[PDB]
């Protein structure tokens, strides 16, 4: 549209496009997650719920391989039973909503695999810096 | 003065000195930014405003090259139209207040350049780890 050619616009703008196109625009959805006599209690619980959700996401990232790299290759493999589709097809064929509908079942085992991989990398790096 | 020779004292102590001298003392101004029946609402909104400002600054850093490195060389160049002064003169001649008065206009374009540089470095690293 207006943002054709130079593929960007405001936040949630890439939500209709494919995940390969949406992958280049991730900084703003990360950005619009933190900033934005009894109603002050509602305002305050909204603000602390926002920062609690943001801190939970940053802590989930920080126990994995990437603190704030925002794109993280890692060392866990991929069970092809989960995706069971053509690999380059999904980056030109699927939205993130449809992909999250696909791997709704295959969740919460990935995160423990990430934690095991990160702790294994940490003990391997501890041994490597220990014997040197 | 008292802190002559070993150039350090408490926070905002280097604010009068030049920016080259003040650059060695940055950990405490970073430190004194977070810690410190209706008045509890005032205390609480002060505390959550403090942590909201600190989280906005840490997120602004985290989308750039440095998560918590506190001194970050990066890959964007410098337009000499902005500073238009002798380079080694400003580290022995200017305070941070005067420097912030100088580049007040030249702001908010630097941050988008930093974001473009970091996203370009991320896609280059993704390609580099992809073809290997």
């Amino acid at each position, epitope marked *: 549209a207006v943002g054709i050619g130079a593929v960007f616009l*405001g*936040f949630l703008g890439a939500a209709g496009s494919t995940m390969g196109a949406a992958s280049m625009t991730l900084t703003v959805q990360a950005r619009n997650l933190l900033s934005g006599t009894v109603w002050g209690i509602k305002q305050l619980q909204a603000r602390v719920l926002a920062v609690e959700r943001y801190l939970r996401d940053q802590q989930l990232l920080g126990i994995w391989g990437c603190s704030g790299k925002l794109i993280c290759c890692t060392n866990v493999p991929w069970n092809s039973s989960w995706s069971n589709r053509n690999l380059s097809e999904i980056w030109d064929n699927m939205t993130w909503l449809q992909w999250d509908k696909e791997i709704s079942n295959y969740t919460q085992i990935i995160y423990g695999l990430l934690e095991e991989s990160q702790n294994q990398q940490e003990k391997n790096e501890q041994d490597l810096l220990a014997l040197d | 003065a008292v802190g002559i020779g070993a150039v350090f004292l408490g926070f905002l102590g280097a604010a009068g000195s030049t920016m080259g001298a003040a650059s060695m003392t940055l950990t405490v101004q970073a430190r004194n930014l977070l810690s410190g029946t209706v008045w509890g609402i005032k205390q609480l909104q002060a505390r959550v405003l403090a942590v909201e400002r600190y989280l906005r600054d840490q997120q602004l850093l985290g989308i750039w090259g440095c998560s918590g490195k506190l001194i970050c060389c990066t890959n964007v160049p410098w337009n000499s139209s902005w500073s238009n002064r002798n380079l080694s003169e400003i580290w022995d001649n200017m305070t941070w207040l005067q420097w912030d008065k100088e580049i007040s206009n030249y702001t908010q374009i630097i941050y988008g350049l930093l974001e473009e540089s970091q996203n370009q470095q991320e896609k280059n690293e993704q390609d580099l780890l992809a073809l290997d």
Partner: nanobody
Amino acid sequence: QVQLVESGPGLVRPSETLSLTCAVSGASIRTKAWWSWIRQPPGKGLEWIGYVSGGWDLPNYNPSLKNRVIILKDTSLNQFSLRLTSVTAADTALYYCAREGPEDFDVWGPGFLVTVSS
């Protein structure tokens, strides 16, 4: 229902810093849009100067404009401003503020002749 109106000089000396400012009503600035500046030398075709975005795009200009064009948005005043440093008398042109959207430049400004003369 959007309405764009330019403001600024139409008569400036060459080798100076030119600057216009287009006010926007009828809609919001921070939309799926490129608030753009497009010019036209008199009797000749159009010349697209550049744009800025209400999102977080970096502004991208025509490289023929020789990096002297800085379009700066003012979301607190619903405006966006053209700049042109070191002008010449051959840069005399009708100037236009416009809005690229899902359709192509629907609401323009009226377009004012900046006649650069010494």
